[PDB]
Structure formats: C-alpha cells, structure tokens
Design a protein around this ligand. Structure first.
Ligand SMILES: O=P(O)(O)OC[C@H]1O[C@H](OP(=O)(O)OP(=O)(O)O)[C@H](O)[C@@H]1O
Ligand SMILES: O=P(O)(O)OC[C@H]1O[C@H](OP(=O)(O)OP(=O)(O)O)[C@H](O)[C@@H]1O
Ligand SMILES: Nc1c(F)cccc1C(=O)O
Ligand SMILES: Nc1c(F)cccc1C(=O)O
Ligand SMILES: [Mg+2]
Ligand SMILES: [Mg+2]
Ligand SMILES: [Mg+2]
Ligand SMILES: [Mg+2]
Lengths: 347, 346
C-alpha cells in the first residue's frame, strides 16, 4: 500500500524502507507526480535517517530508466568516469575535469557525467576552454569514438529530474540526492574514480557500485575534498568483484609533498580554464600533482575491470601513465582534438 | 538567517540558535517560504527532535499572526480541552465532550479545534453535526463565551496565515513538529488547559512551552497512546504551573475506574460521533462516559491550579464530582441545547 505518509513515516521513525519503497518515491518524482513538498520531505528524511545502498540503488536505477541512453554499441566496455558529488565547499580548480582529459590521453575511454557548479564547475570550465558540453547522445557517442572522451550534460540526459533539481536548489542543504549524479551517468561506464564530499555517504555509494559489479574507487580526502588530495591522506573505498574494501591512502608514499589547500584554489571559469592550460602544458606544482594523482586513481579503477593487480604496482603504473600523457603532449593534444571535434559539428 | 543555514543545522542534528525557529516560522506565515522549504523545515526539525524553546518560537510567531478575541472578553480562568490528535485510534470525540461537561460545571471554556485529519470525525466535525456553529469570528465567539459559557475557535478562521503550512502538512501526511502547534495556539490564549499529546516524546516539550507562559496545564499522554486521559491503563501527566513541570504517573483505578478496552472508545463518522455525544450527555453509563468524566475532571483540575490552593488529590476528587454532576443533573445536555440555540439566533 505505497504512499507518502507510509514512506515518510517510516523514515521519520528512523527505519530503513521496505524494498521497493524508494523506487516508488523515485518514480513519483521522475513522472512529475510528486509535489515539491513531498520531494523535499523525502530528500530530507532519507538523509537524516541515513540511506542504505539498497535504497540509493533503487533511486539511481529508477532515475537511469528515465535517462536518454547513448546509442547501442557506442560506449566501450572499458569506459571510465571521473566525477564527484561536489559540495566540498572548498572551491578548487577542476581536478576531476583535468584528470579526465589526462586519463583519456593515456588511452582510457572517458565518458564524463558532469554539470555546472552548484564558482566554476567542470561543465563551466570546459565551456570556457571551447568544448561543446550540450551535445545529444549521437554526438557524445561520436566524440567518444573520435576523440576518446565525451561529456554527458546532465540536464540534456535527465530531463525528467528537473522537478527534483528545482527542489534541491530551493532547499539548498545537501541530501541523498547529491549522491545521484555519479551513480546515474547515462553512458553507464563500469569503472570510475568517484569523489564523495560526505564522509558518511562514501560507503553507501561504494555499496551501490558493488551491487553493479563496477570497478570503482570511491574517494574522500581527509581534508574534506571530493577528490584524492595532496594536502593530506584520503579514504578510499575500493570496489571490485562486487565487494567493498575501505583503505587509507597517503600520497607521501609515492613521493608527493604535502601541499596547502589554497595552492589548489580556483576562480571563475576563465581562471580555471587557464589552470587547465597550464597543467596540460606541463607546468610543475601542486595542481599537476593533484591531477596526476586523480588520473592515476581512475587508471587504477580501469585496470580492475580486467584484473586484480597488486595495489602498489597498479598505482605506480597509473602515475607513470598520467605523467607521460602530460609530458608527451598527449593531454594538451587531446583537449585540442576535443575542441576541434565540437567546432566541426556546425558543418 | 537563511534556509540553507537553518536546514543544514537541523540535518546536522543540532539545536537551532535562538531566533532561527522564529525566523523560519515568520517566513512560513508571511507566505515567503516555498512549499519545499516548509516541508524540509518541518521534517528536519521533527527528526532532530524539537526543543521547548524552538517550539515556543514557532507557536509564538504563529500567535502573532492570529486573529485575537476582542479585549476583555476571555475570562482570566478560561480553559481549553484539546489535543494533537494523530493517535491513530479513531476514538469518539473525548475532548469535545469533556469541554461541554466542563462548561456545564460552570468553568468557562474556550475551545480551539479543527476538522479531522486522519480520523473519521474531528471535534469540529462532530460539533457541526450536533448543530453547533463552528465558523464564528472573534466577536461572536466572545459572545458565545459570555452568553453560553463556551466558545469554539475554528483554526482556519483564526489562523488564515497558517494556510501555506497547513497545505504542506496535508501533502506530506507524516506527523511533524507542526502537529504540536494547534493545542499551543488557541487564539483566545486561555491560561488553563487539559492538553493531549499522542507523541510520548513530545509531550514534555509541549509542557515546556506552557511552563514559559502564565499557565496551569495538564499535558497528558495515555500509556496506550491516546492523546487524552485514558481508562484502559495509566497515563503520564506533565503538570504545569508557576513556570515549572511535575511529571507523574496517573492511574484512574485510584478513583475507582474500571479498566476499559480501547475498542470500547471507538468512534465512527460525524453522525455516529454526534450520537455518542447525545448518549453520554443523556446519562448513558459505560466506558465512554467514564473517559469523558475523567477528562472533564482533568480540565477542572487544571482550572483550579490557576487561583485555588487546592492540592492534587482533593482537586481530582472535586473535579470528578463536578464532572459527574454536570452530566447527571442534565446541565451538560442543557448547555449543549443552549449552545445550539445561540448559534441559530444569528
Ligand atoms: O559546485 P559544487 O557542488 O561544489 O560541485 C563542484 C563540481 O563537482 C562536480 O563536478 P566534477 O567532479 O565533474 O568536476 P571538477 O572536479 O572537475 O570540478 C559537480 O558536477 C561540479 O562540477
Ligand atoms: O483526525 P486526527 O488528526 O486524529 O484528530 C482528531 C482530533 O483531535 C484534535 O481535536 P480535539 O482534541 O479537539 O477533539 P476530540 O473531541 O476528538 O478529542 C484535532 O483537532 C482533531 O479534531
Ligand atoms: N540539474 C538538472 C539535472 F541534473 C537534470 C535535469 C534537470 C536539471 C535542472 O537543473 O533543470
Ligand atoms: N487548517 C488550516 C489552518 F489551521 C489555518 C489556515 C488554513 C487551514 C486549512 O485547513 O487550509
Ligand atoms: Mg570533481
Ligand atoms: Mg572537487
Ligand atoms: Mg482530543
Ligand atoms: Mg483524542
């Protein structure tokens, strides 16, 4: 007998939902049948109760069922995502976006799910670099084939999420909905480096990826970043073979100096675009270090699709590959090809 | 102050800073809060567990927007008999019947009330079915009180600015902190009350709110879940007076009441619950009468806590004698007839 009073009452009683209940709520939300008050009540109550992997998997699966897919056979079986929840409140340079370009230039297909900022988000910085972010399925697929990277603009691919997105903006507070972006990449890559700004939810995210048998590293810098940080240690939930394994990660062990958080600070889209250019041009410093680290992490997750290689050697090769992709010019070249691809669409 | 700040604080499981609940409630009451913001606030405050101070801000803000009764029309010793509802049992209208009995005993009653939310017939629905006019404005409620000894303030008529919150309450269905506010926002502001709370955890908070007012109240929760003094088992009573609270366990067997079953108090539609009122006021004996008498006496005890040095036990004994006598002498039946007549001569 599924209804808002039943489901909200259950959450306010601090109980886990029965199977199917989160799915019912999400189909109400995605069909436009949930009133803004019902959407908001649900988002908040799920959050304060503490969502489970099963519940979030129901939310994400329903949401994915409403998303526009890419055309059949256009996403390589070994594509990776590099993306985070955002909401770390630190306003850094676009680490996930830089790492994605490096990863793709290392020869790993990247299909990025992303969006604007909620100063300058991945999407905004890409636009300032000349990249066309609002392409439909056919052209993302083409971009992926021809350039080795594509970008799925969330509003383009998840039109039915617009009711939920407006509630999110109205209430402001982070909720369980902040987890859905990384879990609803419409290209469904099976590997990724996934940042989570909320330490208490990284494990849940990992659990959802583990139920899908994805090869993923869910990461949270112990300084609060939804990225692998160089300012201190990070916690990594390693997902492979459908099991989650919690780990502490210290970059110092690979020879990385401790950086300060303000060394990674970003600005507007133009500032962040120049930061991307600096790093791809091979400039040394904390930003490159951070990009290389996150790129290596994605490469490590990609490796887990076809092996269970030892952790430390996987990382060493990951960092080497990331570093080479920059220093051979491959990463700077890939960004140029990507811009060129978007400019060809007109004719 | 902002919604992101206040909501973040609540989702972090922190009590709000002084003034923040008031800011939120005033946004809600002025129509400046989006329905999503109203719902988030209501749910987050509920799951955090509201404090007495926070609820006092909510109710106090809500009262600042209400229509008052005209000056000098509510006696100093008027009493309310009302609860949160939401007890899920769909009993007969015990508070409403108790209110009639209390007025018939000679205690001024200004009842706050509203239609049913989850039950089949709320107090207002039942009063309407009895022929009492529930839709009177401040002036005529004050007249009812002077001329009949009882008045009824219908929440939608006295709290028009609460309409945005009320609608969100309906849309989400789940009980929230807002369900506490009815009993705390009687627009006539009576200083005494028998106030039922269906939520064991929140009764204490409601008592706290009354403690900070100039009030003599019994906040009551039946240990079977009723938002009334129950006859099926003990009740917890938060006795409020002089700015403090005395929590105690109350057992009506001490006054010779037989233990009843919950099903014996079950109500039906407005016509059914109206028939139950007429039966009780006509002298019919049984579990329902017993519960009405018990709650009427509770109200009379709260009233005595205003200007009477009577101690707890003697007060109860007197309250029970008065409540029973109001029924048996026909006074309560007569008062209801008078209340209906009053309404028809307008
Ligand atoms: O505005 P916020 O809520 O803080 O989120 C900042 C960014 O983090 C996420 O992107 P992603 O990880 O793809 O991009 P980035 O790390 O390259 O910025 C999100 O889609 C935003 O672009
Ligand atoms: O439908 P529910 O949410 O359970 O509410 C039942 C009733 O409880 C409250 O009234 P009150 O204590 O005045 O009425 P009573 O005579 O029914 O006790 C409320 O105003 C409802 O009328
Ligand atoms: N942010 C959005 C999204 F992620 C999906 C669909 C719509 C929106 C939106 O802001 O309208
Ligand atoms: N229940 C209401 C109330 F208590 C105040 C204002 C409006 C309503 C309503 O039911 O719409
Ligand atoms: Mg990121
Ligand atoms: Mg980030
Ligand atoms: Mg009642
Ligand atoms: Mg009741």
């Amino acid at each position: 007998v599924p209804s808002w009073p039943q489901i909200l009452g259950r959450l306010t009683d601090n109980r886990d939902l029965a199977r199917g209940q989160a799915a019912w709520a999400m189909d109400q939300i995605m069909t436009g049948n949930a009133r803004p008050a019902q959407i908001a009540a649900f988002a908040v109550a799920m959050t304060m109760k503490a969502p489970t992997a099963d519940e979030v998997g129901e939310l994400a699966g329903v949401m994915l069922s409403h998303a526009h897919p890419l055309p059949a056979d256009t996403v390589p079986d070994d594509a990776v995502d590099v993306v985070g929840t955002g909401g770390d409140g630190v306003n850094t340079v676009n680490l996930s976006t830089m790492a994605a370009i490096v990863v793709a230039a290392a020869g790993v297909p990247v299909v990025k799910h992303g969006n604007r900022a909620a100063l300058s988000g991945g999407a905004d910085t890409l636009e300032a670099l000349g990249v066309r972010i609002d392409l439909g399925p056919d052209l993302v697929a083409r971009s992926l084939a021809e350039v080795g990277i594509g970008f799925c603009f969330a509003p383009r691919f998840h039109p039915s999420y617009r009711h939920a997105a407006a509630v999110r903006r109205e209430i402001g507070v982070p909720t369980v909905f902040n987890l859905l972006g990384p879990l609803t990449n419409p290209a469904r890559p099976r590997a990724g480096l996934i940042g989570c700004a909320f330490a208490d939810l990284a494990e849940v995210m990992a659990g959802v990826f583990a139920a899908r048998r994805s090869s993923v590293l869910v990461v949270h810098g112990d300084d609060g970043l939804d990225e692998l940080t160089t300012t201190t240690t990070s916690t990594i939930w390693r997902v492979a073979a459908g099991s989650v394994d919690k780990l502490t990660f210290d970059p110092a062990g690979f020879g990385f100096a401790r950086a300060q958080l303000d060394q990674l600070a970003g600005g507007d889209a133009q500032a962040n675009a120049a930061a991307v250019r600096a790093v791809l041009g091979g400039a040394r410093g904390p930003v490159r270090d951070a990009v290389v680290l996150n790129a290596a992490g994605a490469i490590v997750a990609h490796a887990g699709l076809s092996s269970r290689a030892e952790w430390l050697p996987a990382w060493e090769e990951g960092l080497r590959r990331a570093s080479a992709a920059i220093d051979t010019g491959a990463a700077e070249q890939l960004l140029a090809r990507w811009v060129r691809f978007g400019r060809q669409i007109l004719e």
